[PDB]
Amino acid sequence: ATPHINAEMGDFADVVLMPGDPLRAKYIAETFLEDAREVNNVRGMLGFTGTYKGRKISVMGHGMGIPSCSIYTKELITDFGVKKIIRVGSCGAVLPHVKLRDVVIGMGACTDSKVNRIRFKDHDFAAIADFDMVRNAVDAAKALGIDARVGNLFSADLFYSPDGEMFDVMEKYGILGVEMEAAGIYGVAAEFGAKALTICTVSDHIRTHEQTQTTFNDMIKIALESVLLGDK
């Protein structure tokens, strides 16, 4: 048991999918996993372990924001033997040609946070994902027949930003989605030695303002299927 997770070494698989919402994790366990059982409930952060096509898999929420997800991804890596972490969240689009329900794969993640500058002597650390994992996900999407854009994400500290002009800069630099965790997960994976990847479903559009724990299944199917490709 750790400060934020009440479980023992072995309760989690070496691979864990992590949505920001605890209720979506529960839903993923009920819909995609077999013989699924609850392994954690402290502070309401539901965690589950089960099987997908004979493969042991875990799924647990991580809360909103870098500070919250940094705590959980670190504890799993250092005390529960987790090797791979795949974040399956939602994001906001800034580009004109990006529409709701689109699937994005974050090869990299920009941020307005200071966490990585605190780790890198105040210089620029390129927060990137594991190449193999990115590739496994791309191959899984193709096999499933689902479209998916690979590119940069932007991890925001303020969902309600006081500076809207920064969206112009994001668009100019081809940012595919705005969320609040990627850059933090990638910094942790590198500090504590593990591999990570973030997959997101465009759930709203920052320019047009159109919006949408259920129904984001293609994202899940790609993630689970990409894990098996990695096992081979």
Next chain:
Amino acid sequence: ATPHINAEMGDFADVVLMPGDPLRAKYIAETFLEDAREVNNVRGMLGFTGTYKGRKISVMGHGMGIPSCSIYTKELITDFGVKKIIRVGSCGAVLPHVKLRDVVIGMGACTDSKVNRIRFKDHDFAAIADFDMVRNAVDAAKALGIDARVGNLFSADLFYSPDGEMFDVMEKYGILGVEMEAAGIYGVAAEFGAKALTICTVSDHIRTHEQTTAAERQTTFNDMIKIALESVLLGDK
């Protein structure tokens, strides 16, 4: 109803108490509020509204970290007409004479986050509480025979710090407690024109550990809540 709070105008009181753990909100509602009702459950962040000695009061969790609590407090203030927000949590101690189960009141809050510099043109914005609320809390604590320290808190962005260098620095400058929300909540209150206050009970001490008892810790957590609810009543007068 916003993307994070599925409720309507009137479902929340103009005063909201906010713990970090959503399960703690249910504990508070069940223990101190009368005629309580659930007003939100999105993402599992339970909210409740009831009354305390005839006063309408609400209690809802905010999650861990400045990014999380900044979303909730912001929506409460701009979409549900909330005027006061009081955070009630825990923190770690760095000062030798600050002991476990001590009640700390955050008049100010330092931080390693960059959100207030983004707001303040890259300068130093002193994140502070509302004077009157601090005052009402100090007076409420006294009426209950409880001791309370008033000073600076530190809102950390990384629970697990890469370099344990800041602990010596915080101690050298008198920081009373280390948590993860105060600075962000004070920034939101200033930006949208509302009032806020943070109260914490020392749950752990970085500078040499040495715990106490379960019944004693739980007595102190209840006193903190008692101080919060009673401070509100004094303010109504």
Next chain:
Amino acid sequence: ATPHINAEMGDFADVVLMPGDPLRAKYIAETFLEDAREVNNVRGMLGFTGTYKGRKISVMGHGMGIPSCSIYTKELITDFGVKKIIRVGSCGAVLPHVKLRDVVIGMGACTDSKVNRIRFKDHDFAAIADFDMVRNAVDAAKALGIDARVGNLFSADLFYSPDGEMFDVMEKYGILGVEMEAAGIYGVAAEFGAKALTICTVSDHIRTHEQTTAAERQTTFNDMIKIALESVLLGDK
């Protein structure tokens, strides 16, 4: 004797009043203190020590700007055993509802200076006053039938700033007054473990100014000192 203060331990009281204008020290000594005696004159910064209603008190100017008052407040604290510093000055307002001659008490102080970042490993240090001292001032004021505003102050490094947009930002975040010292003094207090407070009267309203008679100005200045002095006795209780 220190580099900027030629005196010995015991010449200053444990409480010192400090105006920005050096010429204000002699005025205060002969107008409010009893049995005053001179204790400093290095570089022409005259210091005095006497009593107010039996209480031992000292007064001496600090000069304009953070760098200057940092030198004086620090030498007093580490070499003359001073426990409390109270700055008494003027400020400019940016809020429409804040009028000329208003008395403001700075619970916190924002700044564009780098002194605190140099102290706090380039992070955000909330420079705040001592809570009790703030409360003592508020109560002393009420007793004199004067209503004081408590809030954030902004300590500027450039009286003539190249960019004027920062004023809109200060107004948006509730800054009560603009001056040039508070954040420096609060930083020093936290560094050497002492207590500080800044009280100011609005002497000008940046953007849309008014007009004041010399008689009005001395009346307000005297009220501020009276407030500062009575707050010390309240604190002694």
Next chain:
Amino acid sequence: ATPHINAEMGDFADVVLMPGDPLRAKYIAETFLEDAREVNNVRGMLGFTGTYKGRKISVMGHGMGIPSCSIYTKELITDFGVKKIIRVGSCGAVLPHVKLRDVVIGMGACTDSKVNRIRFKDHDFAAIADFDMVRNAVDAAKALGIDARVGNLFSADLFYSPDGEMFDVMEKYGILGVEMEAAGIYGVAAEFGAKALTICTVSDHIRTHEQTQTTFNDMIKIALESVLLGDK
């Protein structure tokens, strides 16, 4: 003709390989290209255009450092219709298990420069390469039977750094190679809309101090071969 390049639209191919040394470009033109001809010589920055297996290809040096290579990559993209840029340079290793002659592919690039902060409102821009290009290079290396590590590079402003302790941070975060251009090329590709990739040969070791315009052929072969995979 541009301020730093004396040529006309059409003199360069839509793809250009760029080593830092002008003499290595000349060597690459003589050794790998057919019917190669000089297209530029201003300030000594030799540029050449020719063919590789019937495919029109260009090769031109860019000088040392981000400021120098920023000028050249920008002019090629805006006035000569260049679509892809592949940097083929050398680097210094910091990790124990990395040895001379090893080939590295930069999926990302960290830096202590301020150029990207000047473009991104002083926030953290993740300087990454084009996914397809990275993948084409990985596939080419496998087909050639050459080993190649994919990861983060570090673009230094000071070859002779006053802070050696920063090498500890680099090593801790898995930096595969230290050079002086990647982060700059990736920022330019994004600003002016083109694709880029950096390939480097470990030419020295920062810890052991062992050192090495010729002989770095595997790097070249992978780059040229990866371009053809991209054409399909």
Next chain:
Amino acid sequence: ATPHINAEMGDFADVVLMPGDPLRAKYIAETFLEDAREVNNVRGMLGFTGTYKGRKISVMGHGMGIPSCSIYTKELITDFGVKKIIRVGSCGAVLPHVKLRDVVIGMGACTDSKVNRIRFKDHDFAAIADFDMVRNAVDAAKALGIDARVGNLFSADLFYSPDGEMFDVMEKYGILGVEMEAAGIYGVAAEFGAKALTICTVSDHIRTHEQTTAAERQTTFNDMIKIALESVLLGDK
């Protein structure tokens, strides 16, 4: 009349000498200038105007620290038509080969202040003196048989810095002396299109200090003024 200088266009010469110690102005006026008359006394900052070998010249203190001298140098330049500012003060040395009482001329000034970054969109602005003024000073000194060191100065915001390692760094990069104004004055000069220069005598040697008689000190101070004054006449050619 300006906020800090109660005078009118024409009361100050187009060249002003400014010491850090306000008490130095009256001394200089009666010891080096002819037919001196008082032109300022606001806040006790006394200013004088007279002639030196027929040339019109003024003297007035600026107070310790960048914020203070920025106010005075700027009002003189924009409201009284001053074209040249020469600071005459003291500094502390960090280099072994720089001895007590040495005269140093600051061609450039480093700093830990943020004033210039605020002016230069957070980039590096090289705060430098006017080349001719520097050369005039070097030649005036030689003619008086005094060899002056020309180089970099460092303007500190904190006389008592929390970190002492910065001194090793200053020594490594050749800093000749440590003071608290030059970078502020040079910034103002560049902002309002005027000329400036800082001349200083080593009054203390940080780390490994020596000892000086009061007689030695006045001799050196007088030499510096003599150097500053003769440099102005050379420049008039």
Next chain:
Amino acid sequence: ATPHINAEMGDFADVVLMPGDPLRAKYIAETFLEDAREVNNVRGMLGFTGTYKGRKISVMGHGMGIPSCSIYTKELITDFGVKKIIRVGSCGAVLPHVKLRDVVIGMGACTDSKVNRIRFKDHDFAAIADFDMVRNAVDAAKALGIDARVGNLFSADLFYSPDGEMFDVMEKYGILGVEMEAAGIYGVAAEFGAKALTICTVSDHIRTHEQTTAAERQTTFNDMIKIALESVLLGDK
């Protein structure tokens, strides 16, 4: 022999002139130096050594940008015993009265690069030239009947700026010319204890273009070199 310069101790003179273009080094060697010989060719950055009026002098290119010229100057100073480095290049003008073919001398150099902050603990290091060298250049220019401005240069990291905002700022603060090396060369000289100087001829004007003639431009470039070589001779005396 280093990884960038394939030569031995004695192959370079203690004074090296450095243009940005390697082809320009050959032009200078062929035009002004007697008995010249090539001493380096690595990466194509040609170096030469010969004599001017019996004085041994070297000339080698440094490439574009601070990262490039920082490598070469550093190796020359620490591995080839070079004492003086004079950069001779071109720059763009921002000031209205600075006209094409004007000779600018960089007493100081501002920059948007971060290399000097990495060296100076994140503070402001004023990147300046060696006084005597500036002086020798001003005196050499005069003996040839040439006019020369002395002031600040700006070393840019991006030739093609993302935001043309800094041009107005540079102009407001009096920058004489825009190039890409000065600040980095001055930083290297300070770090390894050598002397440096940058001289430029205005090759273009951002503020409204309007060129001249080829024969006239080339006459001015030669005068600059003449000023450089002659300034060295004065220094030998």
